[PDB]
Amino acid sequence: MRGKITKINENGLGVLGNILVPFAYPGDEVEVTETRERFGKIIARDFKLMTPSPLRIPGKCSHFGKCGGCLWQGLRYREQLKLKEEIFKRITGIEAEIKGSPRIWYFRNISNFIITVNGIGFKEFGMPKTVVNIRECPIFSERTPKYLKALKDFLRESNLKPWNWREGDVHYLQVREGKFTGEVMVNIIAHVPLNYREALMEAFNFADSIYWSLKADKKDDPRGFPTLVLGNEVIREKVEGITYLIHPSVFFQTNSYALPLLLKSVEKFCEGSKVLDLYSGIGTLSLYLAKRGFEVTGVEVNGTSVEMAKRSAEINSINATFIQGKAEDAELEGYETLIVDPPRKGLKEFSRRIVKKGPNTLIYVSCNPLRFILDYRNYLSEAYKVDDALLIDMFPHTPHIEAVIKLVRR
Ligand code: NA
């Protein structure tokens, strides 16, 4: 099958009739040789690029369909941004403008490198994979080669078996950086206890924090019961003059460079002074808002995250409240604005509670617009209507989108 790629689909794959072609983009003239059935979709196993779309970076990226590394690496950056606006609108029927990442290389502040018998890779969960070789798409750090050399040296000295997909001593090397502080946390994720304390400390002597996280299951997901091996308990990231604390056990917004744009977006959409920030994390939005004079209550399920937020508040002299709990059970009355940042599965049934008891301004933060619009169509629209929306490109070179949607009551 030969033809011209007409659009990209929701997951950022180029469409060729009833074929999906990874790394092909709109305008490409392609020739597909092998396809593979994938849960009722036909996906191109490889293609030859006959004619480059005008969207591609001129050079090698206009001669080969797969320049390398990242699914969208071959698209010029401005052109990726417009394709993100298109997808968002196609999914939600909202026209939202996107703000680019101030920096489009080495922007992520975390990486879970999986350690396999086939060697070390950037892990991502889910099947239209978007970062397939981090050597040809350096989205994380300039120190990545030093992080990996260290790990290899440690696996030498500590004779320790990688993940062979059924078992293995070690499983992931998690590295986290504070982009604006220099601090580096190293978190080995393992299926055995640490024996080579000295070998590990030596290999990662440059890290400010070394952890060893013990997994109690064999599942392929990067989480444990962490043990400080050496150095600081946490690392610091600094954004908009706010010191945030990062622990192996917590989630933090992924792009320290685009994060000011997410913070100012949310602020622009706030209404009144009393803000409830559910899924409040290690205080990313809450501290930013409260520091700017909002009265801010944040609720987060992860207890370690909530501690981090409390400590940040002290460090920064911010006046705000932080509570452990599930967003499902937080009291919504008495507020002017509600922010939600749900996980990928969305609000789900919490929407009925928001429909009844929610405040006048609802702000919804979603890295997954298909799930947003479904929450909206299925529940929120009863009570709410979209008033405004912005996009932030937190994940350059890949089709992922971070949306900030402002809804108000009818
Ligand atoms: Na990298």
Side-chain angles (χ1 to χ4, degrees):
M1 235 215 113
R2 190 195 60 66
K4 172 184 145 200
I5 297 292
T6 72
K7 57 159 207 203
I8 41 161
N9 75 358
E10 28 288 336
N11 278 311
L13 307 176
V15 181
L16 190 67
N18 57 242
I19 282 168
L20 297 171
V21 185
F23 295 85
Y25 316 123
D28 285 359
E29 217 240 292
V30 302
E31 202 173 84
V32 182
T33 9
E34 281 302 323
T35 67
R36 233 113 269 185
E37 214 259 42
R38 303 265 114 135
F39 305 96
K41 298 175 156 187
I42 305 167
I43 282 56
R45 175 67 200 102
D46 64 62
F47 71 105
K48 185 178 186 185
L49 179 63
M50 304 304 284
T51 293
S53 109
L55 305 175
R56 287 177 169 262
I57 309 178
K60 279 327 208 294
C61 284
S62 300
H63 210 177
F64 305 109
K66 168 153 161 40
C67 313
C70 293
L71 219 197
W72 278 18
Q73 198 168 325
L75 286 162
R76 286 200 308 279
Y77 187 61
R78 48 222 123 287
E79 295 310 305
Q80 301 183 7
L81 297 173
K82 292 178 204 193
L83 276 184
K84 278 169 180 163
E85 297 177 304
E86 283 177 39
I87 297 166
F88 185 66
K89 185 185 186 160
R90 181 154 61 245
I91 293 169
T92 77
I94 301 168
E95 297 173 47
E97 333 228 354
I98 184 162
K99 312 196 71 61
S101 166
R103 174 147 179 187
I104 75 176
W105 298 111
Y106 315 115
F107 49 80
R108 282 186 59 112
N109 56 38
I110 181 155
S111 183
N112 299 290
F113 301 99
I114 193 179
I115 311 166
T116 78
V117 296
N118 321 96
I120 296 137
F122 178 86
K123 181 76 190 231
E124 29 170 4
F125 306 97
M127 213 14 115
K129 298 272 178 209
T130 70
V131 184
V132 315
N133 183 16
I134 203 187
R135 289 164 273 125
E136 292 178 307
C137 213
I139 57 178
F140 176 46
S141 181
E142 339 194 16
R143 307 163 234 181
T144 296
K146 142 180 261 208
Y147 296 148
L148 302 189
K149 193 185 175 284
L151 176 75
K152 295 211 201 71
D153 291 346
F154 171 68
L155 296 181
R156 284 167 202 107
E157 262 312 298
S158 72
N159 195 246
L160 277 181
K161 309 146 212 192
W163 194 236
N164 65 36
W165 302 112
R166 288 276 284 186
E167 54 175 342
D169 303 346
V170 301
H171 198 152
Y172 303 72
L173 159 67
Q174 171 183 111
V175 182
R176 308 164 177 251
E177 295 192 335
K179 289 304 170 173
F180 304 99
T181 63
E183 309 201 3
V184 167
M185 163 157 328
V186 160
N187 180 17
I188 315 304
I189 285 164
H191 299 246
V192 291
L194 174 52
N195 267 356
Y196 302 89
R197 227 148 183 72
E198 181 56 50
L200 179 70
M201 276 177 316
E202 236 156 56
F204 288 104
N205 81 309
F206 57 79
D208 300 78
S209 172
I210 298 165
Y211 272 95
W212 187 274
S213 305
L214 186 53
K215 207 158 58 199
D217 54 295
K218 272 74 63 158
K219 186 74 204 73
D220 218 357
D221 74 275
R223 210 44 135 223
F225 308 112
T227 290
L228 180 67
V229 169
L230 182 63
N232 290 301
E233 180 209 348
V234 300
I235 61 160
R236 283 170 259 288
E237 179 65 294
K238 198 172 184 205
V239 171
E240 302 295 281
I242 304 175
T243 297
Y244 289 122
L245 308 183
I246 295 166
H247 182 283
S249 292
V250 307
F251 167 66
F252 174 55
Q253 282 291 348
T254 244
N255 179 336
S256 297
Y257 296 102
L259 179 59
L261 307 183
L262 171 59
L263 292 181
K264 291 170 162 184
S265 255
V266 172
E267 189 186 12
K268 184 176 200 188
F269 292 164
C270 288
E271 286 287 8
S273 88
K274 293 208 174 213
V275 178
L276 179 66
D277 185 24
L278 304 177
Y279 309 101
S280 90
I282 67 167
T284 309
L285 299 187
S286 332
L287 293 161
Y288 175 65
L289 292 176
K291 169 172 205 179
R292 310 269 302 165
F294 295 86
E295 301 183 45
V296 182
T297 310
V299 188
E300 165 60 44
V301 83
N302 168 356
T304 313
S305 280
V306 165
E307 171 183 356
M308 296 306 104
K310 284 160 171 294
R311 293 162 61 168
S312 277
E314 289 183 301
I315 289 169
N316 290 291
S317 303
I318 288 169
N319 211 91
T321 306
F322 289 110
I323 312 161
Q324 199 285 334
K326 321 229 297 298
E328 293 92 59
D329 351 289
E331 187 55 69
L332 313 181
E333 292 162 29
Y335 297 100
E336 294 162 296
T337 303
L338 168 60
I339 299 152
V340 295
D341 192 3
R344 278 185 178 284
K345 66 164 158 303
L347 295 173
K348 296 204 146 156
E349 293 166 289
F350 177 44
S351 305
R352 288 191 211 76
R353 194 179 158 60
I354 294 180
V355 159
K356 304 157 192 178
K357 295 172 170 62
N360 285 312
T361 320
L362 166 69
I363 299 180
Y364 188 139
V365 177
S366 164
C367 67
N368 173 4
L370 174 56
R371 166 62 66 217
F372 161 72
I373 198 66
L374 278 165
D375 285 358
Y376 173 76
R377 273 209 172 106
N378 290 349
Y379 298 115
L380 300 178
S381 42
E382 247 173 300
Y384 289 84
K385 71 196 166 194
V386 178
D387 172 58
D388 212 341
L390 255 164
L391 306 185
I392 300 94
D393 189 9
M394 295 276 297
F395 328 108
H397 312 295
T398 87
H400 299 115
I401 298 167
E402 183 84 341
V404 180
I405 298 140
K406 174 184 184 172
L407 304 102
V408 293
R409 278 188 161 283
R410 299 177 184 281

